[PDB]
Structures are given as C-alpha cells and as structure tokens.
Amino acid sequence: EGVAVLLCVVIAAWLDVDAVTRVLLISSVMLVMIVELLNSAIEAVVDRIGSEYHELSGRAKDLGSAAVLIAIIDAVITWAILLWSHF
Amino acid sequence: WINEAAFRQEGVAVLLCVVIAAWLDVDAVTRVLLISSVMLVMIVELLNSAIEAVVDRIGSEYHELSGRAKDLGSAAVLIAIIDAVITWAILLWSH
Amino acid sequence: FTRIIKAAGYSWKGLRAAWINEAAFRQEGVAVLLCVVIAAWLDVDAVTRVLLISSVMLVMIVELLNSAIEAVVDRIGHELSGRAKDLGSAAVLIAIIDAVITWAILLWSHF
Ligand SMILES: CCCCCCC/C=C\CCCCCC(=O)OC[C@@H](O)CO
Ligand SMILES: CCCCCCC/C=C\CCCCCC(=O)OC[C@@H](O)CO
Ligand SMILES: CCCCCCC/C=C\CCCCCC(=O)OC[C@H](O)CO
Ligand SMILES: CCCCCCC/C=C\CCCCCC(=O)OC[C@H](O)CO
Ligand SMILES: CCCCCCC/C=C\CCCCCC(=O)OC[C@H](O)CO
Ligand SMILES: CCCCCCC/C=C\CCCCCC(=O)OC[C@H](O)CO
Ligand SMILES: CCCCCCC/C=C\CCCCCC(=O)OC[C@H](O)CO
Ligand SMILES: CCCCCCC/C=C\CCCCCC(=O)OC[C@H](O)CO
Ligand SMILES: CCCCCCC/C=C\CCCCCC(=O)OC[C@H](O)CO
Ligand code: NA
C-alpha cells in the first residue's frame, strides 16, 4: 500500500509538468493515504470496544471505507484531468 | 454508506458542484481544485459520521469526551466547508 | 436550516476546547492563520493561492479529526488504543509535511 505512493511520485517526477500540476498529482495521492490512516484508526477504536458485532460498529467502518473510496475517486479524477491536459 | 438519510442533502450538494465544475470553461488545474475541494467536504463528513457512530456505539451515558469528540468532528467539517467556499470564490471570482 | 445551526454550535465548541486545552494547538492555529493571510497578500495566480491556503487548512482538518479520535480513545479509558493514536498521528504528520513541501515548492517558483 506504500509502494503505490512512491510509484506515483516517480511518475509525477518522470512526467514533465509544472510545479502546480506536480503538487496536485502528489497531494491527491497523499490525501488517500491520510484518509486510509484515519479510517484504520477508527477501525482500531471499533475493535478496541470489542469483537461482538454491533449495528453502530459496522456503520462506523462503512462510513470510514466510503471516505477512502471518495478520496480514491478524487485521485483518479485528478490524474485523469491533469494528464489529459498535459498531453 | 447509508445514502438513505441526511447524507442525501450533503451528497447532492457535493454531486451538483462536481457536475457544475465538470461543465465550466476553466483550465484543468482550476477544474481539479473545484472538484476536490467539495470532494473533501464529503470525505470529512463521512469521517465525522464514523466517529459519531463509534461514540454512540460506546453507549447513551453522556461523557465530556464524547461530546468533545463529536464537537471536534464537526469543527473539521466546518473547516472543510470554509476551504471549499474560499476555493470556489478565489477561482471563480474572475468569471 | 436548524441542523446547520446546531452543527455550527458543536463546531465552535470544538474549536474552543481545542484552543483552550493546548498551547500546541493554539500555536498551530497561529501558524495556519499567518499562512492564510500571507497567501492572501502574495502576488501569485489564483490557483497557487488556493494551494497555499488549502494545504495548511487540510492540516487543521486532520488535526481536528485526529483529536476527535484521541477523545474517543480516552473516553473508553489498549494495544489498539495505542495503535489508533499512532495511525491518527501519522496522518497529522503527513498533512503537515505536505503543507511545508507545498509551500516550499510553490514559493521557490514565485520567488
Ligand atoms: C435553479 C437554478 C440552479 C442553478 C444552479 C447553478 C448554476 C451555475 C452555473 C450555470 C452555468 C453552467 C456553466 C456554463 C458554461 O460555463 O459553459 C461552459 C462553456 O464551455 C460554454 O461553451
Ligand atoms: C511550523 C512553521 C510555521 C511557520 C508559519 C509562519 C511562516 C509561514 C510562511 C513563511 C514564508 C512566507 C514569508 C515570505 C513572504 O512573506 O513574502 C512576502 C512577499 O509579498 C514579498 O514580496
Ligand atoms: C498514466 C498512469 C498513471 C498511474 C498512476 C495513477 C494513480 C491514480 C490514482 C491512485 C490513487 C490511489 C492510491 C493507491 C491506493 O491506495 O488505491 C489502491 C486501490 O486498491 C485501487 O486504486
Ligand atoms: C466515472 C465514469 C465517467 C468517466 C469520467 C471520469 C473522468 C474524470 C473526470 C471527468 C470530470 C471532468 C470532465 C470535464 C473535462 O473536460 O475533463 C477534461 C479536462 O478539462 C482537461 O483535462
Ligand atoms: C473569508 C472566508 C469566508 C467563507 C466562509 C463561508 C462559510 C459558510 C458556511 C459555513 C458552514 C456553516 C456551518 C456548517 C457546519 O457547521 O458544518 C457541519 C458540522 O460541522 C458537521 O456536520
Ligand atoms: C462563487 C463561489 C462561492 C460559492 C461556493 C459554492 C459552493 C462551494 C462549496 C460548497 C460545498 C459544501 C456542500 C456540502 C454541504 O453544504 O453540507 C452541509 C451540511 O449541512 C453539513 O453537515
Ligand atoms: C459567493 C460569496 C462567497 C462568500 C465568501 C467570500 C469570502 C471568501 C473569498 C473572497 C474572494 C476575494 C476575491 C478573490 C479573488 O479575487 O481571486 C483572484 C485571484 O486571487 C487572482 O490572483
Ligand atoms: C479562514 C481561516 C480559518 C483557519 C482556521 C482557524 C484556525 C483554527 C482554530 C483557531 C480559531 C478558533 C478560535 C479559537 C477559540 O475558540 O478561542 C476561544 C477563546 O480563546 C477562549 O475563551
Ligand atoms: C484574522 C485572520 C483572518 C484570516 C483571513 C481569512 C481570509 C481567507 C481568504 C481570503 C480570500 C483571499 C483573497 C485573495 C485576493 O485578495 O485576491 C486578489 C487578487 O490579487 C485579485 O486579482
Ligand atoms: Na484542504
């Protein structure tokens, strides 16, 4: 999950884009990492309370995962738009 | 996750902004900023709701830190909304 | 609009407690505000201005979400307790490091 970031930075570097584009390409990937980290923290808290299933436990994890999904969608859109424009 | 509640209004506001941003005659960089700033609001709202779910999971008995966690989560949503408004204002002010 | 009113109120409570309770949060708040004001007065294009502002504001957003998580953990009273705080703090640090780099990249180009 950490190799994805490095690969993206390398691509952003290997690409001949201006500083602004490079910042957006990289920051969009960093945001995904941030959100995953926050989602995992919440999952850790849920599991801390106990292993017994609960409606609100699943809810918390679903909300967290949805946030990761939105961040990934935001990253894909970003890379699609800037590379379409670059080329 | 459960798009059948108050995530409706939040989510259509976001969705509508993405659609508007998709149609605007702006450069690529601007379009990305318009879309991601509203996208961030959705992300932060989702994380905020998740925290609220964990708090409610623990129980109904009130605790100072329970209210604090929820208050902190809301403040984050507020900052994200202010960031989106500022973004759209700065970028669109030319139009 | 009554929902937004109550939500605005929780928010102010959140900012207020964060501020009152830790100097580190207050000093971080000063830093962000100083960066927004500088960004607001720099001779840069609209796009660059937004990146300068949204990077340090993301820092504030992540700081608050992480603090929310700390509050939940502390509320419960713990290997996963430590793990939750660890994952949360990493998130804060990524946000901060990204803001600093973003500011260094952009200002080096415009200066
Ligand atoms: C009840 C009214 C709701 C209105 C929703 C908000 C509408 C905001 C902006 C509408 C203008 C859409 C953008 C049109 C435009 O810029 O065209 C792009 C350009 O390619 C035209 O050739
Ligand atoms: C953890 C450190 C936080 C520091 C927060 C306060 C410093 C933030 C940014 C410092 C760089 C901006 C200073 C350069 C500057 O202001 O140039 C002004 C420009 O208009 C001159 O023509
Ligand atoms: C021209 C090819 C460009 C290749 C790089 C495009 C990458 C765009 C978005 C990646 C953002 C996601 C970061 C990695 C991640 O955590 O997602 C993994 C998911 O399982 C699927 O992406
Ligand atoms: C999700 C399925 C539909 C496929 C669309 C995904 C492509 C990613 C973002 C599309 C939203 C922006 C469309 C507007 C547009 O003109 O994009 C091109 C940019 O202006 C230049 O790169
Ligand atoms: C100089 C910048 C001016 C921009 C300020 C625009 C702010 C407009 C509306 C702020 C949002 C109103 C409160 C909404 C809110 O409280 O968020 C919801 C809760 O935080 C969680 O649901
Ligand atoms: C002329 C540009 C200035 C106007 C800004 C246009 C709108 C830009 C960003 C709005 C994004 C916020 C939508 C989400 C939202 O409002 O949720 C509110 C909920 O009630 C909060 O819990
Ligand atoms: C639609 C009402 C928006 C309510 C919030 C207003 C306060 C927030 C931002 C004010 C924007 C001030 C003008 C920005 C502007 O002119 O951008 C131009 C670029 O900075 C060019 O470098
Ligand atoms: C448009 C820029 C907004 C950037 C975010 C502002 C920085 C975040 C928090 C600091 C501002 C919150 C106010 C602090 C506060 O409530 O003070 C309470 C009193 O000092 C206690 O009596
Ligand atoms: C006491 C701290 C208050 C913090 C200030 C928050 C203000 C946030 C955003 C202000 C909007 C930025 C204005 C940008 C601007 O003036 O553009 C002017 C351009 O030069 C016009 O082309
Ligand atoms: Na931001």
Author numbering:
A (entry chain D): 34 to 120
B (entry chain A): 25 to 119
C (entry chain B): 7 to 68, 72 to 86, 90 to 123
Q: What do the authors report?
A:
Native SAD (single-wavelength anomalous diffraction) is a de novo macromolecular structure-determination method in which the phase problem is solved by exploiting the anomalous diffraction signal of light atoms present in the crystal. Here, the combined use of these two strategies is described to solve cases of native SAD phasing that were particular challenges: the integral membrane diacylglycerol kinase (DgkA) with a low Bijvoet ratio of 1% and the large 200 kDa complex of the CRISPR-associated endonuclease (Cas9) bound to guide RNA and target DNA crystallized in the low-symmetry space group C2. Here, we present two challenging native SAD cases solved by collecting low-dose data at multiple orientations from three crystals each: the integral membrane diacylglycerol kinase DgkA (Li et al., 2013; 2 × 42 kDa asymmetric unit, space group P212121, 2.6 Å resolution) and the large Cas9–RNA–DNA complex (Anders et al., 2014; 200 kDa asymmetric unit, space group C2, 2.2 Å resolution). Here, we show that multi-crystal averaging of data sets used in conjunction with a low-dose, multi-orientation strategy is beneficial in difficult cases where data from one crystal are insufficient.
Previous SAD and MAD attempts at the Zn absorption edge were unsuccessful. The structure was originally solved by Se-SAD phasing at the Se peak using crystals diffracting to 2.05 Å resolution. The crystals used in the current study only diffracted to 2.6 Å resolution (see §2.1.1).
